[PDB]
RNA sequence: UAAUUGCGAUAACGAACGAGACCUUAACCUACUAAAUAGUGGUGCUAGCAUUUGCUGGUUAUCCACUUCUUAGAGGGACUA
């Protein structure tokens, strides 16, 4: 049983891509900044309705091929947007306006993330790199050793007040994920030990674990804060995107069936988040590849494979 | 100068002609492969490519003078506004030119129409082709004219492919029962393309991957 | 004392884009290595010109032709012209703008 | 009509041989992938085999194919 | 400088380049106002966009469009392509997302060639005839 | 609001300007009126015979207001029109010079017109403003 | 099928030409490069008409800014997804 599970709260639609990246910003909590396959974000102001929990208001049209990472800092006035026209956008959430450029990836950037400084922007990419940038476009940190393509980077939001070790942690398709000191620009961890590869990864909101996996559906969880192996979750399908819960040890992982949400602490499947598919088949479900817990863990933002964000709010039991 | 850009490119079409057609006409002895033209400040550079250039240099200064002053003489050129060198080319078993002009020779020598034509095939297979055709054909003691090709390798017929690797070269060999047309093809080796398509566009090669490394539970090194 | 401005406008015209734009891109660099001011080169629209011929059959033409302006020395005006000669591409050095 | 030659299901078939992982029946990574793991002579040409490495994919994503 | 867009509509080779500017309304042709055109059946075809999102929307917006080459038809169908495209490009950039969404239902639902762009040209004529696909004219001997 | 002869449809006002210019009199029309072609590509003679020379005034006016300059020749250009070859297909022939001319030496007689560096007519400033006047009277007749 | 293009049975198995593949064109580039030998607005200066702001001129330089329309280069884009 339970005494919390995710109930289907609304959908979004202005999109014709798939929706390959959600942002939260705790800013605003009224805010989906939105990259999606169609060569443009569109950013929403989150109403909060029932059958059209928020309205679009901006399509960031400037990127020249399919969009695939977006995050916010966690104001909610940047969008830092990676496609795969090898570029990344700094654009404001609610002008468009791309701020600066980022150019220097020789492949699709699938990566961006800021620290929770809102200072440093990492970017992963189908090149097997990873560049550190500014705000204002100097490619400070080119990190190599990835033997296949850099999945994801993500900023770990760092323990104990950013004990002077800016770790980013890249999930990479040589199956190992790399935790990256930014002090001297080199190695911190190797978590090896994927079946196939790693498509994403996530870091605990304190910055203590990596839970990470790829086509295998192994999202070993790792204690980043020790740089050692805690265990494994086994989600049996091609895992997409890896979100810690804000507030809660729940991870949030994107199947290619779906949404599983499953506690860490105590170690359960909370849900099994497959809105029914009428007229889809079997394999031909739609399946979220980006999703992300809010603000506040409580509705969980989805972009699936069917162009649709929907959205899910944690409703008690009764 | 006061000429049109347009009619400035025909022009030099036309004297990038005359030069082919000229020293097609006089060098084939020597085995000529081709002219280029380039003009520098000081000089104008029209460069043999053949086979037998010291045949071209002349005695201490001769005929490469005389070549330059038949030049100067009908262009109105300055001396020295006309600047030809010559350059023994590389590699005349690839050059379909200069081998359509050895069955040019080899016909006018009396030789063989069979057995030194395959030689020639031979020849250019040693110098490491991708195919070689010849086409020697004519009226020899029949009145009814006739064709004999020779091939070996490997050829291409159609497509940029022809425009790529492939060199087709007709050369009339004038002999006393009538005149022959020589047409040699050869197929160089897009190995050895070394400025463009490495091999056919109809390339496709899938990497045979690894023997992979399986699951290899967790094992975390720490740095 | 040397190196005056003269204002130099360079016309490159060719037939073949990969000549004509390694030389003008190398007038680009060469002239900005050593800090020049070009006005960086300007495309003149290509020359389409169509040809008849005799069952019948037609041809065509590639006039590329564009200029890149060097508010330049004299001193490496003279460098930049003599150095990176090339087959078949026509340079044009005319001098400021009248 | 679209009618696929010998080279192309050869190819696709090859790249299912030796690389069912890495292409699956998503065509805008086969692009990506197939750039990354095969000398297709042709931007067309691979999109061609890119998308018959969808379609074999595809098939084989629900059962086995001949040979 | 305003809240502004440019925008152009493109029929068979009648080009329209349009200025979307932030004003007080006008839609002017070349000199003159997108009434007075004259084709004078095709004036309703150029009335169009402006009616099926209601009139009004260009009173905060000045719609300035010159027009170059073609015919008046091509003219007037690619002077339209260019306001409707600088419409929903001025509702997109400064108005927000779902107000183009709104635009983009409005226009999409009628679609006459306000958005979208035709690949249709004047397609090359071959020897031995005068045109693309017709021959010359024979006997049989 | 304001007025300019760009803002009035062409037709109306060439009437407007035509039936104006005949009140004001001030004419130059030379003598060979109506015994005149008026256009090579064309046969008859125009059809009202007292006038077509406003007409025309009034057409070259408004052509020069809302163009940089006109010539002579691109006043033949433009009036000039297609004959019939007879048993051969149409052709486009410049106009009779000396009466598009004529009407350029009338308008440059009233200020309505005067002759444009680069070549040409430009419109005059009481051109331009005799244009746009009655212009706005050819509105104001039509409010 | 457009194709001995293939599928798919099938005393073979791997080959070759050709087709395909490649060359080039009408398409999209609101992302890159620039352009007084292409366009944009503003600004100067100013003609006319209404003025309450404005509309329409003109100006191979009165200057500033842009490359969306124009150009022509790059690739992407399409594989019937």
Not at chain 1, 72 to 87: E, I, P, Q
Not at chain 1, 147 to 152: A, L, P, T
Not at chain 2, 4 to 17: M, P
Not at chain 3, 59 to 72: F, G, P, Q, V
């Given at each position: 049983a339970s005494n919390e599970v995710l109930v289907l709260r609304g959908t979004l639609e202005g999109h014709n891509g798939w929706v390959t990246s959600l942002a939260t910003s705790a800013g605003q909590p009224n805010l989906l900044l939105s990259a999606s396959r169609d060569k443009t974000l569109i950013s929403w102001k989150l109403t909060g309705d029932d059958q059209k929990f928020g309205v679009p208001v901006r399509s960031f049209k400037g990127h020249s091929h399919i969009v695939q990472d977006?995050?916010?800092?966690?104001?909610?006035?940047?969008?830092?947007?990676?496609?795969?026209?090898?570029?990344?956008?700094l654009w404001d959430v609610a002008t468009g306006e791309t701020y600066q450029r980022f150019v220097g990836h020789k492949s699709d950037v699938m990566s961006v993330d800021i620290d929770k400084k809102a200072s440093m922007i990492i970017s992963g990419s189908?090149?097997?790199?990873?560049?550190?940038?500014?705000?204002?476009?100097?490619?400070?940190?080119?990190?190599?050793?990835?033997?296949?393509?850099?999945?994801?980077?993500?900023?770990?939001?760092?323990?104990?007040?950013?004990?002077?070790?800016?770790?980013?942690?890249?999930?990479?398709?040589?199956?190992?994920?790399?935790?990256?000191?930014?002090?001297?620009?080199?190695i911190e961890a190797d978590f090896i030990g994927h079946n196939s590869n790693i498509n994403t990864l996530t870091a605990s909101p304190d910055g203590t674990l990596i839970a990470s996996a790829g086509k295998d559906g192994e999202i070993m969880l790792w204690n980043l804060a020790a740089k050692k192996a805690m265990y494994t979750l086994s989600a049996q399908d091609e895992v997409f995107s890896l979100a810690f819960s804000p507030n809660r040890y729940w991870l949030a992982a994107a199947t290619a069936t779906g949404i599983k949400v499953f506690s860490l602490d105590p170690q359960y499947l909370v849900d099994d988040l497959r809105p029914e598919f009428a007229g889809y088949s079997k394999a031909a479900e739609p399946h979220a590849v980006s999703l992300a817990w809010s603000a506040d863990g409580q509705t969980l933002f989805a972009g699936y494979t069917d162009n649709v964000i929907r959205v899910w709010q944690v409703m008690t039991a009764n | 100068?006061?000429?049109?850009?347009?009619?400035?490119?025909?022009?030099?079409?036309?004297?990038?002609?005359?030069?082919?057609?000229?020293?097609?006409?006089?060098?084939?002895?020597?085995?000529?492969?081709?002219?280029?033209?380039?003009?520098?400040?000081?000089?104008?550079?029209?460069?043999?490519?053949?086979?037998?250039?010291?045949?071209?240099?002349?005695?201490?200064?001769?005929?490469?003078?005389?070549?330059?002053?038949?030049?100067?003489?009908?262009?109105?050129?300055?001396?020295?506004?006309?600047?030809?060198?010559?350059?023994?080319?590389?590699?005349?078993?690839?050059?379909?030119?200069?081998?359509?002009?050895?069955?040019?020779?080899?016909?006018?020598?009396?030789?063989?129409?069979?057995?030194?034509?395959?030689?020639?095939?031979?020849?250019?297979?040693?110098?490491?082709?991708?195919?070689?055709?010849?086409?020697?054909?004519?009226?020899?003691?029949?009145?009814?004219?006739?064709?004999m090709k020779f091939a070996d390798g490997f050829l291409i017929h159609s497509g940029q492919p022809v425009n790529d690797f492939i060199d087709t070269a007709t050369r009339h060999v004038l002999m006393r029962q009538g005149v022959l047309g020589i047409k040699v093809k050869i197929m160089r080796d897009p190995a050895k393309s070394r400025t463009g398509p490495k091999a056919l566009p109809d390339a496709v090669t899938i990497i045979e991957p690894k023997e992979e490394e399986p699951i290899l539970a967790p094992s975390v090194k720490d740095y | 004392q040397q190196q005056q401005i003269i204002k130099i406008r360079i016309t490159?015209?060719?037939?073949?884009?990969?000549?004509?734009?390694?030389?003008?891109?190398?007038?680009?660099?060469?002239?900005?290595?050593?800090?020049?001011?070009?006005?960086?080169?300007?495309?003149?629209?290509?020359?389409?010109?169509?040809?008849?011929?005799?069952?019948?059959?037609?041809?065509?033409?590639?006039?590329?032709?564009?200029?890149?302006?060097?508010?330049?020395?004299?001193?490496?005006?003279?460098?930049?012209?003599?150095?990176?000669?090339?087959?078949?591409?026509?340079?044009?050095?005319?001098?400021?703008?009248? | 009509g679209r009618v696929r030659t010998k080279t192309v299901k050869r190819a696709s078939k090859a790249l299912i041989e030796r690389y069912y992982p890495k292409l699956t029946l998503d065509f805008q990574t086969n692009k990506r992938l197939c750039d990354e793991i095969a000398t297709i002579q042709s931007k067309r040409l691979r999109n061609k085999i890119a998308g018959y490495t969808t379609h074999l994919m595809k098939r084989i994503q629900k059962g086995p194919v001949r040979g | 400088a305003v809240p502004s867009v440019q925008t152009f509509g493109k029929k068979k080779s009648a080009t329209a380049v349009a200025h979307v500017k932030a004003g007080k309304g006008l839609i002017k042709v070349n000199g003159s106002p997108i009434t007075l055109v004259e084709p004078e059946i095709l004036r309703f075809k150029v009335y169009e966009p402006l009616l099926l999102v209601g009139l009004d929307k260009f009173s905060n917006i000045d719609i300035r469009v010159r027009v170059t080459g073609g015919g008046h038809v091509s003219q007037v169908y690619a002077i339209r392509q260019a306001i409707a495209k600088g419409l929903v490009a001025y509702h997109q950039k400064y108005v927000d997302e779902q107000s183009k969404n709104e635009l983009k239902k409005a226009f999409t639902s009628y679609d006459r060639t306000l958005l979208i762009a035709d690949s249709r040209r004047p397609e090359p004529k071959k020897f031995g005839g005068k045109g693309a696909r017709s021959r010359f004219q024979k006997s049989y001997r | 609001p304001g007025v300019s002869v760009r803002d009035v449809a062409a037709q109306d006002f060439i009437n407007a300007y035509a039936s104006f210019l005949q009140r004001q009199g001030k004419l130059e029309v030379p003598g060979?009126?109506?015994?005149?072609?008026?256009?090579?590509?064309?046969?008859?003679?125009?059809?009202?015979?007292?006038?077509?020379?406003?007409?025309?005034?009034?057409?070259?006016?408004?052509?020069?207001?809302?163009?940089?300059?006109?010539?002579?020749?691109?006043?033949?250009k433009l009036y000039g029109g297609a004959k019939s070859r007879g048993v051969r297909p149409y052709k486009h022939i410049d106009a009779s010079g000396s009466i598009n001319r004529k009407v350029l030496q009338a308008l440059e007689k009233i200020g309505i017109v005067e002759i444009s560096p680069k070549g040409g007519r430009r419109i005059s400033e009481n051109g331009q403003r005799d244009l746009d006047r009655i212009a706005a009277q050819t509105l104001e007749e039509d409010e």
């Open positions: 977006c995050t916010l800092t966690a104001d909610g006035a940047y969008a830092l947007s990676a496609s795969w026209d090898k570029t990344l956008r189908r090149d097997k790199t990873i560049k550190v940038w500014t705000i204002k476009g100097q490619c400070l940190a080119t990190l190599l050793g990835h033997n296949d393509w850099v999945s994801q980077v993500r900023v770990v939001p760092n323990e104990k007040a950013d004990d002077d070790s800016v770790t980013i942690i890249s999930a990479g398709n040589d199956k190992m994920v790399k935790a990256w000191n930014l002090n001297q620009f080199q | 100068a006061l000429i049109s850009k347009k009619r400035k490119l025909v022009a030099d079409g036309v004297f990038y002609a005359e030069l082919n057609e000229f020293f097609t006409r006089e060098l084939a002895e020597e085995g000529y492969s081709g002219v280029e033209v380039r003009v520098t400040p000081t000089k104008t550079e029209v460069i043999i490519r053949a086979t037998r250039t010291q045949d071209v240099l002349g005695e201490n200064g001769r005929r490469i003078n005389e070549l330059t002053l038949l030049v100067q003489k009908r262009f109105k050129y300055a001396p020295g506004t006309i600047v030809l060198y010559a350059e023994r080319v590389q590699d005349r078993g690839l050059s379909a030119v200069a081998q359509a002009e050895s069955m040019k020779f080899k016909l006018l020598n009396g030789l063989a129409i069979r057995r030194a034509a395959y030689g020639v095939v031979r020849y250019v297979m040693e110098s490491g082709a991708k195919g070689c055709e010849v086409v020697v054909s004519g009226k020899l003691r029949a009145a009814r004219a006739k064709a | 490159l015209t060719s037939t073949k884009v990969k000549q004509l734009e390694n030389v003008s891109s190398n007038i680009v660099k060469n002239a900005e290595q050593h800090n020049l001011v070009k006005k960086g080169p300007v495309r003149l629209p290509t020359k389409v010109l169509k040809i008849s011929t005799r069952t019948w059959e037609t041809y065509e033409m590639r006039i590329h032709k564009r200029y890149i302006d060097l508010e330049a020395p004299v001193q490496i005006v003279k460098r930049i012209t003599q150095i990176t000669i090339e087959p078949g591409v026509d340079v044009e050095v005319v001098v400021a703008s009248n | - | - | 060979y009126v109506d015994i005149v072609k008026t256009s090579s590509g064309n046969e008859m003679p125009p059809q009202d015979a007292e006038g077509w020379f406003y007409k025309r005034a009034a057409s070259v006016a408004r052509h020069i207001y809302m163009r940089k300059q006109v010539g002579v020749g691109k006043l033949n």
